[PDB]
Design an enzyme around this catalytic site. Structure first.
Site, mmCIF file in Angstrom:
data_model
loop_
_atom_site.group_PDB
_atom_site.id
_atom_site.type_symbol
_atom_site.label_atom_id
_atom_site.label_comp_id
_atom_site.label_asym_id
_atom_site.label_seq_id
_atom_site.Cartn_x
_atom_site.Cartn_y
_atom_site.Cartn_z
ATOM 1 N N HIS A 41 9.611 4.958 -1.691
ATOM 2 C CA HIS A 41 9.045 3.668 -2.081
ATOM 3 C C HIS A 41 10.024 2.806 -2.881
ATOM 4 O O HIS A 41 9.659 1.699 -3.293
ATOM 5 C CB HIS A 41 7.731 3.856 -2.860
ATOM 6 N N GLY A 143 9.127 3.475 -14.168
ATOM 7 C CA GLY A 143 10.540 3.779 -14.126
ATOM 8 C C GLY A 143 10.872 5.249 -14.013
ATOM 9 O O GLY A 143 12.054 5.591 -13.889
ATOM 10 N N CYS A 145 9.770 7.435 -11.597
ATOM 11 C CA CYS A 145 9.798 8.005 -10.256
ATOM 12 C C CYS A 145 11.211 8.456 -9.916
ATOM 13 O O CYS A 145 12.195 7.820 -10.302
ATOM 14 C CB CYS A 145 9.279 6.999 -9.232
HETATM 15 C C1 LIG Z 1 7.247 5.312 -10.354
HETATM 16 C C2 LIG Z 1 7.871 4.153 -9.534
HETATM 17 C C3 LIG Z 1 9.125 3.632 -10.270
HETATM 18 O O1 LIG Z 1 9.592 4.288 -11.145
HETATM 19 O O2 LIG Z 1 9.685 2.373 -9.919
HETATM 20 C C4 LIG Z 1 10.238 1.672 -11.013
HETATM 21 C C5 LIG Z 1 10.548 0.226 -10.621
HETATM 22 C C6 LIG Z 1 5.761 5.137 -10.682
HETATM 23 C C7 LIG Z 1 5.316 6.250 -11.635
HETATM 24 C C8 LIG Z 1 3.866 5.964 -12.191
HETATM 25 C C9 LIG Z 1 3.817 4.601 -12.847
HETATM 26 C C10 LIG Z 1 2.877 4.854 -14.084
HETATM 27 N N1 LIG Z 1 2.947 6.377 -14.275
HETATM 28 C C11 LIG Z 1 3.498 6.979 -13.213
HETATM 29 O O3 LIG Z 1 3.652 8.149 -13.115
HETATM 30 N N2 LIG Z 1 5.036 5.217 -9.416
HETATM 31 C C12 LIG Z 1 4.181 4.256 -9.046
HETATM 32 O O4 LIG Z 1 3.962 3.318 -9.762
HETATM 33 C C13 LIG Z 1 3.438 4.382 -7.691
HETATM 34 C C14 LIG Z 1 4.121 3.544 -6.630
HETATM 35 C C15 LIG Z 1 3.438 3.704 -5.251
HETATM 36 C C16 LIG Z 1 4.128 2.820 -4.219
HETATM 37 C C17 LIG Z 1 3.504 5.146 -4.768
HETATM 38 N N3 LIG Z 1 2.063 3.897 -7.889
HETATM 39 C C18 LIG Z 1 1.201 4.534 -8.673
HETATM 40 O O5 LIG Z 1 1.497 5.527 -9.246
HETATM 41 C C19 LIG Z 1 -0.250 3.954 -8.852
HETATM 42 N N4 LIG Z 1 -1.204 4.979 -8.399
HETATM 43 C C20 LIG Z 1 -1.867 4.637 -7.304
HETATM 44 O O6 LIG Z 1 -1.795 3.544 -6.851
HETATM 45 O O7 LIG Z 1 -2.616 5.572 -6.753
HETATM 46 C C21 LIG Z 1 -3.567 5.107 -5.824
HETATM 47 C C22 LIG Z 1 -4.703 4.319 -6.520
HETATM 48 C C23 LIG Z 1 -5.718 4.999 -7.180
HETATM 49 C C24 LIG Z 1 -6.737 4.284 -7.799
HETATM 50 C C25 LIG Z 1 -6.746 2.895 -7.761
HETATM 51 C C26 LIG Z 1 -5.731 2.215 -7.098
HETATM 52 C C27 LIG Z 1 -4.712 2.928 -6.477
HETATM 53 C C28 LIG Z 1 -0.512 3.643 -10.341
HETATM 54 C C29 LIG Z 1 0.605 2.739 -10.809
HETATM 55 O O8 LIG Z 1 -1.745 2.981 -10.488
HETATM 56 C C30 LIG Z 1 -2.731 3.532 -11.379
HETATM 57 C C31 LIG Z 1 -3.794 2.458 -11.643
HETATM 58 C C32 LIG Z 1 -3.422 4.730 -10.729
HETATM 59 C C33 LIG Z 1 -2.127 3.950 -12.724
#
Ligand SMILES: *[C@@H](CC(=O)OCC)[C@H](C[C@@H]1CCNC1=O)NC(=O)[C@H](CC(C)C)NC(=O)[C@@H](NC(=O)OCc1ccccc1)[C@@H](C)OC(C)(C)C
Ligand SMILES: *[C@@H](CC(=O)OCC)[C@H](C[C@@H]1CCNC1=O)NC(=O)[C@H](CC(C)C)NC(=O)[C@@H](NC(=O)OCc1ccccc1)[C@@H](C)OC(C)(C)C
Lengths: 305, 306
Positions: A41, A143, A145
């Site tokens: 991603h 940040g 990931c």
């Molecule tokens: C790492 C990406 C990164 O480092 O890029 C930097 C520019 C993050 C790590 C997360 C952020 C907060 N804590 C963590 O461990 N990864 C992401 O943000 C993910 C990116 C996707 C493209 C995979 N997104 C999420 O982790 C997201 N979860 C999610 O969407 O799960 C599905 C969902 C569940 C319920 C409702 C909506 C969606 C997080 C950011 O969203 C929350 C609301 C679940 C926290």
């Protein structure tokens, strides 16, 4: 004596973390030989994380759209490809600090050390266990990931986890280093949830052995139990069933302590039915399940690497 | 989100661990520039454990009575001196892996990472607080002495602890890198006991703030307290007194959460009175006191989950 949640020394993995940038998105990568691994991603902007088409997003990318930073030294990307949910970037330079390593996929109940990184820079280390529901109770912010989980089997680093996402209940999900998710999750931001979890029974018992080894024996009792009657009580408290292979793995700890596995099971049954009665075990008021039998042995025998 | 006991990455310290041998005794030493630092009881024999005169033991040694091994390379000792409870071995080679570093003496309540080592090699890393009674709740076996505790700030390693001994309740005692023990302990095997320990109140408050940052408010209440009344109640649970300086260091966390410090104090009073009643806070069923305000800021998000 003493018993602490104890991570592996992280120096060998520290020398492998790099910063990977694609457009406005930056995260962490793992640099081993002449390839950098990171979550696929990274090729997403903030505006296509709902239903990304990773094939299409990557088709429009060239090697020069990837910026890899190792310290203040840039690594030229000379090739790129996806493997499942991991992006693989071939770079012009083999990591001189590549340790002896392998990629392993772990099972629920197994533990690993996490090196939490931001902008390619290691910020902290801690222990996690892969839960039966294939989540981990980590500590991860934006940040993070690309941060990796690992074990050391003396000199060989076994990479087992790369961090991808957070779930609503605040628990964490990721992949092995071949990009296969642990658990029924996908790398997009549509609604998903962790399933109901259970307690890792064999780890609880290993922790009780750690307790006995550290001079705490108040929970031991002279009762016995069969394997079946313990599993009958366990599932009532939402404990994973105890198998013969689990009993067998607890053998070395049973041998060292002189407490047969079924006798520790009878003590755990009484702990489950009656509670701790205001007492604590190894500083905890809950029955801890994130120490594997080998975790106990490694710590209580001072195994080094 | 999430909240874990988190150590500093140990690579910079791993590069400084060596093995020191004097006679039949082997322990760990810390190699920085051309000095190796280790506990002075490496020079003791089985007859020198109750009342060793370390000055008289050390004058009987030459440089070549000390064998220092870094990996499978022996470093040659070219000078030795004793500073309080540590030995300083001058070696003929500066450690090329020496990080930027400082020696610091920490205050009770502060935390650090411990790199547990045996025979000069790392076993694992974990987080420790200096207890109010100047012990730490570590994990140390025979052979662990010379293991060091540290904090890392912008690639500068602040060494604060070197391990020396275990007490009969299972807690541990040691020195700063100048060899001065924390607490009233001495490096003799005469009977010794840690003083009555207490809970680090400012750290418990920091942890409750962590819980609120991570989205949990169930333990708050509508009350407030004076500082004096809070200290009168919390001392009845064996809690350290909270000072105005502690109130001030909690200011950033108070401002991020909108919860006045004395209002969180009111929450703590009620948690002590009520217990958890089957609930947890940040995954724990007891009140956690080994996270400093700094540890919380370092690990928690800068934006509260409102
Ligand atoms: C790492 C990406 C990164 O480092 O890029 C930097 C520019 C993050 C790590 C997360 C952020 C907060 N804590 C963590 O461990 N990864 C992401 O943000 C993910 C990116 C996707 C493209 C995979 N997104 C999420 O982790 C997201 N979860 C999610 O969407 O799960 C599905 C969902 C569940 C319920 C409702 C909506 C969606 C997080 C950011 O969203 C929350 C609301 C679940 C926290
Ligand atoms: C490091 C050096 C070593 O291993 O040498 C082995 C001969 C150890 C670290 C200890 C070992 C167990 N866990 C640890 O953290 N340090 C020592 O062995 C100390 C050497 C002295 C010369 C300082 N001794 C002890 O730690 C000793 N404690 C002790 O004597 O405290 C005083 C005391 C208090 C009450 C009653 C008697 C003595 C330990 C090893 O002895 C026990 C029995 C208290 C555990």
């Amino acid at each position: 004596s003493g018993f602490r949640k104890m991570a592996f020394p992280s120096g060998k993995v520290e020398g492998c973390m790099v910063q990977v940038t694609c457009g406005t998105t930056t995260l962490n990568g793992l640099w081993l030989d002449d390839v950098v691994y990171c979550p696929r991603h990274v090729i997403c902007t903030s505006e296509d994380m709902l239903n990304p088409n990773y094939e299409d997003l990557l088709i429009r990318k060239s090697n020069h759209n990837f910026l890899v930073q190792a310290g203040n030294v840039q690594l030229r990307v000379i090739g790129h490809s996806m493997q499942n949910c991991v992006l693989k970037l071939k770079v012009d330079t083999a990591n001189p600090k590549t340790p002896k390593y392998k990629f392993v996929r772990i099972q629920p109940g197994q533990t690993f050390s996490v090196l939490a990184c931001y902008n390619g820079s290691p910020s902290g280390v801690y222990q996690c266990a892969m839960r039966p529901n294939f989540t981990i109770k980590g500590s991860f912010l934006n940040g993070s990931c690309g941060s990796v989980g690992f074990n050391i089997d003396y000199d060989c680093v076994s990479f087992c986890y790369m961090h991808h996402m957070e779930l609503p209940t605040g628990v964490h999900a990721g992949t092995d280093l071949e990009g296969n998710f642990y658990g029924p999750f996908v790398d997009r931001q549509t609604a998903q949830a962790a399933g109901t979890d259970t307690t890792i029974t064999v780890n609880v018992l290993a922790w009780l052995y750690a307790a006995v080894i550290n001079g705490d024996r108040w929970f031991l009792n002279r009762f016995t139990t069969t394997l079946n009657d313990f599993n009958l009580v366990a599932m009532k408290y939402n404990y994973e069933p105890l198998t013969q292979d689990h009993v067998d793995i607890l053998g070395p700890l049973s041998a060292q302590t002189g407490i047969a596995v079924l006798d520790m099971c009878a003590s755990l049954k009484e702990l489950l039915q009656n509670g701790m009665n205001g007492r604590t075990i190894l500083g905890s008021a809950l029955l801890e399940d994130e120490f594997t039998p080998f975790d106990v042995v490694r710590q209580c025998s001072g195994v080094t690497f």
